[PDB]
Design a protein around this ligand. Structure first.
Ligand code: HEM
Ligand code: HEM
Ligand code: HEM
Ligand code: HEM
Ligand code: HEM
Lengths: 230, 230, 230, 230, 230
């Protein structure tokens, strides 16, 4: 099944939205119902799978929530994103703060390493998401040296098996080279893993790893809508 | 033939526009008709050739669609751009997010390499566009060394004949040195080509290659207008 | 008690808010009462401890005040922040300018060094807060060399015992690695400490240390509200 | 006369303005008349000389037009700029996007090199304008080495006599060190000159050279006003 | 005398404001009277000394005027700044663009060098103001080497005795390390001094010296208000 997983085509998108104060209002039952119906229709259509909806309140100033969804074709993700912005009140009263796009590809050296969403694992309660850009000479470095560096990098995360990693190529889908998403039952586990991962040689070959988006998964869109400002 | 193609003068522009939420509205038949009439008049005039209209939804937060058009004189492009912003409702309800200008010139060493729009090829279904700035010492480097680096760079793209490249000088037309546009029937081909091109020595002489704009070509302006946010 | 203080889990947040001119109005008695009731309810609930409210007027153009609060679970901080933005007029008429999140962890070498808020010290009259990012090679450097550098760094502050330091890990909670907060009875002491600390080898291993937020602690929220613009 | 030209005191300003969509309207006869009267009064007063008015449409997203004007005293330029923003509808419905200030000084080595506006040449149909910041060690370089580098730089532009250069010091008048303005009858000449000038050793001593503003000179302000967005 | 000047406590602030077009209006007599009354009350209170009010029109796009004021305690500056933004129409119709804070301290080596405002000199007709950040290794450099570099730097300004310099520490009061203000009867003298100062070894140890604010001192607030955009 590993060959099928490595050969499968899956576009993934983290759509980060910022709430506009004073636009949502105080009566939100109909907004909740409309958003829930939109997501139910997305699920029924069977093209775009909504991996998660995350509350980003308190993480950074310019973000309020995030939608992680995956589809076989990128045009399906485009249609879902445009429809969410166009035909839902929740989409109309929110601005797009950041979009993280990626396309699933097999790893360069360790082909047994696959994204958590590709392997169909249960999403974690807490997520962190950020783009990544390697150094200019990273890819033309001696393949044995890069393979050893990546092996040490992966070994450094052996003490955090409860944190599931998604490392997806993001070339030509934005300003970045990779999209990284870490899911864990507890946020402190993600923080500790990020702290521990600084002790790796791979840190010498980093150009950009911002912005960060840290959020808590919500069971339903009502829980997210009822906490938004304005 | 090739000498004439290398000697012809052609200005090209990627005009990227962002939709203003709450401005387009829900009734869009007359807006579609007016935009289509504007583009038909542009085609009839025969000065500005609209190479393509692309839907950028889901690519990045600050972009919504893109117009790629080419004219012999830059005054004609200026007039078309101003007229689109001034006399069309679609232009009036959109903000200009980014402009990529370029002027066609023959290549430094491989004079047989020509832009896809200069060759008059059929535009691809998917496009990616970004500006490019080389390193400070790139142009004063030993011409033989730079020629060999560029030859290896080109050779690295031998496995993607279905991805057509447009590399056009952009000096003094903006903040950048080159404008790069890649057209392909499938987006995954563009992503794979961009990933593969990282394994080149030319990556050691890069200063700026952002922002990126990835989009899908639309057959007519109605298809684009009907998906924009209200 | 030191082991428990190094083992306790505490999330800390500096929520920086900017006032919107013309939104607060001139009649502020009811706004003051509502904000005071919100903070009293926060204190009564016993989950989120508001360490301080600080007036940032005159520090920088994009900030007006700041709330420093600490909770055992980050979801409690999220709920408090969202509730402040949603159910108080003061939170509705202000924008979020910057959020500094951190999770308390024991120090790498000097485990006797603890944050002032962890030790339960009385907050100082003046505070300065900024994020911090170390150099790429800082964590993979020889542990003895880094320990010596950090020892010299801490020793350089021998002459400022009245300035209490809070150095908290901030990995995966934002764009930064550390969150630093210095509390002192006098602002000039903070300025002198920051000037003196430039004479350390650790300054050779700094990547980002901005933005800064310098403020005065207010006894009650009325004192802050009565000086806000508009 | 060369000594008199070198000793002459002349402040020059490129004031770049961006049109606010929806503010100018459709009836522009009275606006055109008022702007023309303002510029005629400026010419009659004899203090501020308007070198040119340039249409920047299609160059970059944040610019719409530019005014190049020169006066003996900088307070005269300040007064003219304030009056244009205050007493003309065109000034009131536009935002200031960028200001390039400079004061004429003789060249360091080649004192025969003078700005085109100092020599009183006829302005070209096309202009490009950008600020410039040299490297930190550029000025403390060995004077003979810097003189040789500058001589080679000037010699590299021997094939573009139709492009007139304006290199003016800009220290303490902004964020930059120099203001550069190139005027040519054809835009392609400016593009070719900028491309050719990359093959110089001086490119090794560049820190900032952006933003760029490329525009076409208009005969009268009516031509500019009639093309601005509504 | 000099010991008292080096030991006195003085906070200084440059508050830069940008005018909001369409907010001031055309009838400005009462606004002028209210602003003048506010400044007269500030003078009468005797705590905050307004060193100057400067017209920044034509300097940069994001600035319109500047207030330079000095007080013994930073709380007094905070109160004056908040009161200006809160109780004056001029403060209400303007937005803070940049704040430069500093605290007077004696120089490291040449203790006879004091800020012009500390020595009580008459303010010049023209001012330039900018923040400054030294290199990372500047303060841990060999003290004799740094002293020699600073001596050569100071000596390089031997030919500009008419330009008075204010170099004040700015640590922990913002994003910067130093705040520099140069006052001169003529702006061309400031430009020439800044040009000449580039020929110093100290230029090798600069990290940040922007933004710049150049302005002309006004005799009274009416002169400033009457030129602001409507
Ligand atoms: C539990 C956490 C993590 C695990 C298990 C892990 C493991 C791995 C593995 C096995 C690979 C495959 C490399 C190969 O063989 O080609 C990989 C790739 C990668 N990892 Fe991680 N890693 C973790 C955390 C991180 C962190 C914290 C970062 C960045 C701060 C990161 C950045 C990357 C990137 C960008 C790649 C793409 C390969 C490349 O850059 O060439 N990962 N990771
Ligand atoms: C199918 C894809 C590509 C093909 C066939 C290709 C091939 C070429 C060729 C033949 C040249 C002219 C070399 C010469 O004049 O000696 C060229 C120029 C250039 N290419 Fe590509 N390339 C491709 C992709 C890319 C990518 C991915 C980038 C950047 C990330 C890029 C950046 C450039 C630039 C900036 C130039 C201008 C020449 C210069 O910088 O001096 N190209 N390319
Ligand atoms: C009264 C003021 C200060 C005191 C007493 C102090 C002392 C200390 C001590 C004892 C540590 C423990 C390091 C270890 O044992 O591993 C530490 C860590 C740290 N300090 Fe300070 N310091 C002060 C000011 C500063 C300043 C001014 C900065 C930055 C400009 C700073 C940045 C840091 C950082 C980032 C750490 C985390 C350790 C690391 O980076 O690996 N501190 N400090
Ligand atoms: C037709 C085009 C050009 C001509 C004729 C030309 C020639 C010259 C000459 C003769 C000088 C006097 C240097 C001296 O002896 O002190 C000069 C200065 C200068 N040039 Fe050019 N140049 C041209 C284009 C450019 C370009 C394309 C740039 C930058 C991209 C540039 C940047 C500068 C600067 C910044 C100076 C100031 C001197 C300094 O930096 O120390 N010029 N130029
Ligand atoms: C008339 C103009 C100027 C005069 C008379 C002057 C002179 C001095 C003197 C005597 C000091 C004392 C240094 C010491 O004793 O430790 C000093 C400090 C300083 N000067 Fe200047 N200078 C001038 C212009 C400038 C300029 C143009 C800059 C920056 C572009 C600058 C940046 C600084 C800074 C940042 C310091 C703080 C000391 C330090 O960085 O360690 N000054 N200046």
């Amino acid at each position: 099944n590993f060959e099928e997983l490595n050969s499968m085509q899956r576009y993934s998108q983290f759509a980060v939205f910022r709430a506009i104060p004073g636009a949502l209002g105080s009566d939100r039952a109909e907004i909740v119902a409309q958003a829930q119906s939109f997501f139910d229709g997305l699920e029924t259509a069977g093209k775009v799978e909504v991996r998660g909806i995350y509350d980003l309140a308190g993480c950074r100033a310019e973000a309020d929530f995030m939608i992680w969804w995956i589809a076989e074709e990128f045009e399906e993700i485009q249609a879902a994103f445009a429809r969410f912005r166009r035909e839902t009140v929740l989409g109309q009263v929110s601005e797009v703060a950041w979009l993280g796009n990626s396309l699933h590809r097999p790893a360069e050296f360790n082909r047994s390493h696959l994204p958590s969403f590709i392997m169909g694992e249960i999403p974690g309660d807490w997520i962190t998401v950020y783009p990544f850009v390697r150094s200019y000479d990273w890819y033309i470095m001696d393949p044995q040296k890069r393979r050893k560096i990546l092996a040490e990098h992966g070994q450094a995360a052996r003490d955090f098996p409860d944190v599931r990693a998604n490392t997806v190529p993001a070339f030509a889908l934005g300003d970045y080279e990779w999209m990284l998403a870490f899911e864990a039952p507890r946020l402190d586990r993600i923080v500790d893993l990020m702290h521990k991962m600084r002790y790796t040689e791979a840190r010498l070959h980093v150009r950009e790893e911002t912005p960060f988006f840290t959020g808590r998964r919500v069971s339903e869109v009502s829980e997210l809508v009822n906490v938004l400002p304005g």
